[PDB]
Scaffold this motif. Structure first.
Motif, PDB file in Angstrom:
ATOM      1  N   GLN A 192       0.617  -1.218   0.004  1.00 18.25           N
ATOM      2  CA  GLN A 192      -0.146  -0.139   0.224  1.00 18.25           C
ATOM      3  C   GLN A 192       0.844   1.330  -0.006  1.00 18.25           C
ATOM      4  O   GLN A 192       1.444   1.750   0.904  1.00 18.25           O
ATOM      5  CB  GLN A 192      -1.025   0.072   1.102  1.00 18.25           C
ATOM      6  N   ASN A 193       0.812   1.920  -1.206  1.00 16.72           N
ATOM      7  CA  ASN A 193       1.734   3.403  -1.236  1.00 16.72           C
ATOM      8  C   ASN A 193       2.887   3.232  -1.814  1.00 16.72           C
ATOM      9  O   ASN A 193       3.643   4.065  -1.398  1.00 16.72           O
ATOM     10  CB  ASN A 193       1.420   4.323  -0.055  1.00 16.72           C
TER      11      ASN A 193
ATOM     12  N   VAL B  38       5.787   8.051 -10.606  1.00 19.49           N
ATOM     13  CA  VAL B  38       4.702   7.113 -10.143  1.00 19.49           C
ATOM     14  C   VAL B  38       4.364   6.368 -11.636  1.00 19.49           C
ATOM     15  O   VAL B  38       4.063   7.371 -12.608  1.00 19.49           O
ATOM     16  CB  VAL B  38       3.520   8.190  -9.804  1.00 19.49           C
TER      17      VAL B  38
ATOM     18  N   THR C 267       3.346   3.159  -7.142  1.00 21.86           N
ATOM     19  CA  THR C 267       2.155   3.740  -6.958  1.00 21.86           C
ATOM     20  C   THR C 267       2.449   5.354  -6.156  1.00 21.86           C
ATOM     21  O   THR C 267       1.945   5.852  -5.609  1.00 21.86           O
ATOM     22  CB  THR C 267       0.991   3.236  -6.361  1.00 21.86           C
ATOM     23  N   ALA C 268       3.810   5.537  -6.106  1.00 19.44           N
ATOM     24  CA  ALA C 268       4.492   6.470  -5.457  1.00 19.44           C
ATOM     25  C   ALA C 268       5.963   6.790  -5.982  1.00 19.44           C
ATOM     26  O   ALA C 268       6.411   5.863  -6.466  1.00 19.44           O
ATOM     27  CB  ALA C 268       4.186   6.623  -3.814  1.00 19.44           C
TER      28      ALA C 268
ATOM     29  N   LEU D  24      -4.870   1.396  -8.556  1.00 18.92           N
ATOM     30  CA  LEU D  24      -4.974   2.012  -7.075  1.00 18.92           C
ATOM     31  C   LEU D  24      -5.880   0.742  -6.277  1.00 18.92           C
ATOM     32  O   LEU D  24      -5.939   0.662  -5.157  1.00 18.92           O
ATOM     33  CB  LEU D  24      -5.453   3.242  -6.961  1.00 18.92           C
TER      34      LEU D  24
ATOM     35  N   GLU E 288      -4.067  -2.092  -5.117  1.00 16.74           N
ATOM     36  CA  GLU E 288      -3.221  -1.814  -3.976  1.00 16.74           C
ATOM     37  C   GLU E 288      -4.147  -1.614  -2.750  1.00 16.74           C
ATOM     38  O   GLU E 288      -3.570  -1.492  -1.554  1.00 16.74           O
ATOM     39  CB  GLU E 288      -2.258  -0.542  -4.026  1.00 16.74           C
ATOM     40  N   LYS E 289      -5.284  -1.634  -2.868  1.00 15.03           N
ATOM     41  CA  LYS E 289      -6.288  -1.552  -1.742  1.00 15.03           C
ATOM     42  C   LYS E 289      -6.919  -2.857  -1.336  1.00 15.03           C
ATOM     43  O   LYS E 289      -7.814  -2.891  -0.536  1.00 15.03           O
ATOM     44  CB  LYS E 289      -7.476  -0.485  -2.140  1.00 15.03           C
TER      45      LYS E 289
END
Length: 166
Positions: free
Chosen positions: A60-61, A96, A117-118, A141, A144-145
């Motif tokens: 995540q992130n 990103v 993702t960052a 996204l 990743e959730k």
């Protein structure tokens, strides 16, 4: 971003439910060998590739990882050149939505990759960046959730049910 010379896609679905398509642009002039290996693993023109593989790691992130079509755990995979191939270009940095080659040290590129993702500058210089998510970042996204267990493994399988070149 570098010049995009080819586009490929992934049709993703987290088990009996379709998530969508991720379109990726490849940097053919900056990493010819790396992009072709990926391109051919996408089209499966060799009888093996990303079709039906999974994203075994999700952080995540930071990023999501996949491309292990041999062991599905993050220990396998293979290139169209053989077990492993050398680092072709380490000058392109991360941003990103970057498609980067996962490895276990210098010159251990196989078939495993990840999508950031960052911003991940600490990876610059150690991973070959060869692509960019041109479309479908919202699909990323969503991936990743998803709920993950130990080692950040998705509880439910995030499967690439289809892939190919546009």
């Amino acid at each position: 971003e570098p010049e995009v010379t080819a586009k490929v896609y992934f049709d993703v679905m987290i088990d009996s439910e379709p998530l969508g398509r991720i379109t990726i642009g490849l940097f053919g002039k900056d990493a010819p060998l790396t992009t072709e290996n990926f391109r051919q693993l996408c089209t499966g023109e060799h009888g093996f590739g990303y079709k039906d593989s999974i994203f075994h790691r999700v952080i995540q992130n930071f990023m999501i990882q996949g491309g292990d079509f041999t062991n599905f755990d993050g220990t396998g995979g293979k290139s169209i050149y053989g077990e492993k191939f050398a680092d072709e270009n380490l000058n392109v940095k991360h941003f990103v939505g970057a498609l980067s080659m996962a490895n276990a040290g210098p010159n251990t590129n196989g078939s495993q990759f990840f999508i950031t993702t960052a911003p991940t500058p600490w990876l610059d210089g150690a991973h070959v960046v060869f692509g960019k998510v041109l479309d479908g970042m919202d699909v990323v996204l969503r991936i990743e959730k998803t709920k993950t267990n130990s080692h950040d493994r998705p509880v439910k399988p995030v499967k690439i049910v289809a892939s190919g070149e546009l």
